[PDB]
Design an enzyme around this catalytic site. Sequence first.
Site, PDB file in Angstrom:
ATOM      1  N   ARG A  53      26.216  -2.311 170.643  1.00  0.00           N
ATOM      2  CA  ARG A  53      25.510  -1.932 169.594  1.00  0.00           C
ATOM      3  C   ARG A  53      26.249  -0.988 168.729  1.00  0.00           C
ATOM      4  O   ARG A  53      26.318  -0.529 167.430  1.00  0.00           O
ATOM      5  CB  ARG A  53      24.212  -1.329 169.628  1.00  0.00           C
ATOM      6  CG  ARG A  53      23.447  -2.099 170.686  1.00  0.00           C
ATOM      7  CD  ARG A  53      23.389  -3.537 170.317  1.00  0.00           C
ATOM      8  NE  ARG A  53      22.004  -4.285 171.094  1.00  0.00           N
ATOM      9  CZ  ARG A  53      22.194  -5.504 171.121  1.00  0.00           C
ATOM     10  NH1 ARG A  53      22.941  -6.372 170.401  1.00  0.00           N
ATOM     11  NH2 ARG A  53      21.351  -6.107 172.158  1.00  0.00           N
ATOM     12  N   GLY A  99      14.856  16.218 164.362  1.00  0.00           N
ATOM     13  CA  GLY A  99      13.915  17.552 164.903  1.00  0.00           C
ATOM     14  C   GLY A  99      13.886  17.022 166.201  1.00  0.00           C
ATOM     15  O   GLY A  99      13.375  18.031 166.966  1.00  0.00           O
ATOM     16  N   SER A 110      16.003  16.131 168.531  1.00  0.00           N
ATOM     17  CA  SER A 110      17.298  16.481 169.278  1.00  0.00           C
ATOM     18  C   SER A 110      16.865  17.507 170.059  1.00  0.00           C
ATOM     19  O   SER A 110      16.435  18.530 169.770  1.00  0.00           O
ATOM     20  CB  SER A 110      18.509  16.331 168.623  1.00  0.00           C
ATOM     21  OG  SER A 110      19.035  15.303 167.905  1.00  0.00           O
TER      22      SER A 110
HETATM   23  C1  LIG Z   1      16.987  11.282 159.295  1.00  0.00           C
HETATM   24  C2  LIG Z   1      18.337  11.277 159.496  1.00  0.00           C
HETATM   25  C3  LIG Z   1      19.112  12.016 158.340  1.00  0.00           C
HETATM   26  C4  LIG Z   1      18.862   9.917 159.866  1.00  0.00           C
HETATM   27  N1  LIG Z   1      19.273   9.052 160.199  1.00  0.00           N
HETATM   28  C5  LIG Z   1      19.004  12.137 161.121  1.00  0.00           C
HETATM   29  C6  LIG Z   1      19.437  13.400 160.704  1.00  0.00           C
HETATM   30  C7  LIG Z   1      19.545  14.268 161.807  1.00  0.00           C
HETATM   31  C8  LIG Z   1      20.158  15.634 161.508  1.00  0.00           C
HETATM   32  O1  LIG Z   1      19.561  16.578 162.574  1.00  0.00           O
HETATM   33  C9  LIG Z   1      20.212  17.703 162.945  1.00  0.00           C
HETATM   34  C10 LIG Z   1      21.265  18.205 162.271  1.00  0.00           C
HETATM   35  C11 LIG Z   1      21.836  19.641 162.502  1.00  0.00           C
HETATM   36  C12 LIG Z   1      21.089  20.436 163.492  1.00  0.00           C
HETATM   37  C13 LIG Z   1      19.830  19.650 164.122  1.00  0.00           C
HETATM   38  C14 LIG Z   1      19.407  18.490 163.739  1.00  0.00           C
HETATM   39  C15 LIG Z   1      18.134  18.073 164.329  1.00  0.00           C
HETATM   40  C16 LIG Z   1      18.163  16.637 165.375  1.00  0.00           C
HETATM   41  O2  LIG Z   1      19.314  16.444 165.833  1.00  0.00           O
HETATM   42  O3  LIG Z   1      17.019  16.140 165.596  1.00  0.00           O
HETATM   43  C17 LIG Z   1      19.333  13.697 163.137  1.00  0.00           C
HETATM   44  C18 LIG Z   1      18.550  12.416 163.394  1.00  0.00           C
HETATM   45  C19 LIG Z   1      18.436  11.954 164.716  1.00  0.00           C
HETATM   46  C20 LIG Z   1      17.907  12.812 165.628  1.00  0.00           C
HETATM   47  C21 LIG Z   1      17.762  12.191 167.011  1.00  0.00           C
HETATM   48  C22 LIG Z   1      17.976  10.796 167.173  1.00  0.00           C
HETATM   49  C23 LIG Z   1      18.389  10.214 165.945  1.00  0.00           C
HETATM   50  C24 LIG Z   1      18.637  10.440 164.791  1.00  0.00           C
HETATM   51  C25 LIG Z   1      18.362   8.733 166.800  1.00  0.00           C
HETATM   52  N2  LIG Z   1      17.537   7.931 166.211  1.00  0.00           N
HETATM   53  C26 LIG Z   1      18.046   8.982 168.350  1.00  0.00           C
HETATM   54  O4  LIG Z   1      17.981  10.325 168.376  1.00  0.00           O
HETATM   55  C27 LIG Z   1      18.450  11.725 162.362  1.00  0.00           C
END
Ligand SMILES: CC(C)(C#N)c1cc(COc2ccccc2CC(=O)O)cc(-c2ccc3c(c2)[C@H](N)CO3)c1
Length: 236
Positions: free
Chosen positions: A161, A186, A188
């Site tokens: 994938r 948010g 992660s």
């Molecule tokens: C919504 C958007 C833009 C899209 N696509 C996007 C943006 C970000 C940016 O987030 C940060 C950047 C810097 C620092 C901290 C963070 C916050 C973070 O990582 O949670 C993260 C994810 C995202 C997070 C977790 C995840 C996935 C996508 C997968 N689905 C599987 O797990 C999606």
Amino acid sequence: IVGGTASVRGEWPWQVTLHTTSPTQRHLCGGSIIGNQWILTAAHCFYGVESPKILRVYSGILNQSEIKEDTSFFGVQEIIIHDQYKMAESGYDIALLKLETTVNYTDSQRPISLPSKGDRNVIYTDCWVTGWGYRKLRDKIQNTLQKAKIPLVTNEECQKRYRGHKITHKMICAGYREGGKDACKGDSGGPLSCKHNEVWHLVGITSWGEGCAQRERPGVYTNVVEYVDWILEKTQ
Ligand SMILES: CC(C)(C#N)c1cc(COc2ccccc2CC(=O)O)cc(-c2ccc3c(c2)[C@H](N)CO3)c1
């Protein structure tokens, strides 16, 4: 979390919310309590973070609205990022926060065990991803901690994938073929928690993926068992 449901008090007591305090106070990432002064989270959360001074760790939180000007939190004494970390999609997306004081364990805040030594052959069939992240694209941080049960997919399927990326055995993937449930912005740094013999283990750290809950685009997590030597060395 996309496609999840509201958690209740005490349901995921290892889950913490990491806040940044400048230029505004907001939830930045999730994390997991793994010891009395130790949070395990994702390295990529700390992009642009000038020092641990602007972080606050809140434990025992269900609703972000609970956090007021007098809510207790832990300062962060040290941020330990894996020395091989470069970008989330390459791997090594793992970090420890050493807290300024110890966490007193209660029904709302306690550690989660790492995958056990000797459990290589264990097949995890009951895994849950939790967090306050987006429930869709262009959303906001959610008030109530969300949960979703997600099945692990093999690294071989995951690699098919994500042909433009290197999926290594230091990563694990989880998602449904038709999408619908996944972590998102948010989430992660938070846990992928799997229950085995009625004991929860921290199997993954939410790390990256293409979009959120898209079909055939599973979430990619740091495979915690492959970092136990590193975790133990840093926390000893
Ligand atoms: C919504 C958007 C833009 C899209 N696509 C996007 C943006 C970000 C940016 O987030 C940060 C950047 C810097 C620092 C901290 C963070 C916050 C973070 O990582 O949670 C993260 C994810 C995202 C997070 C977790 C995840 C996935 C996508 C997968 N689905 C599987 O797990 C999606």
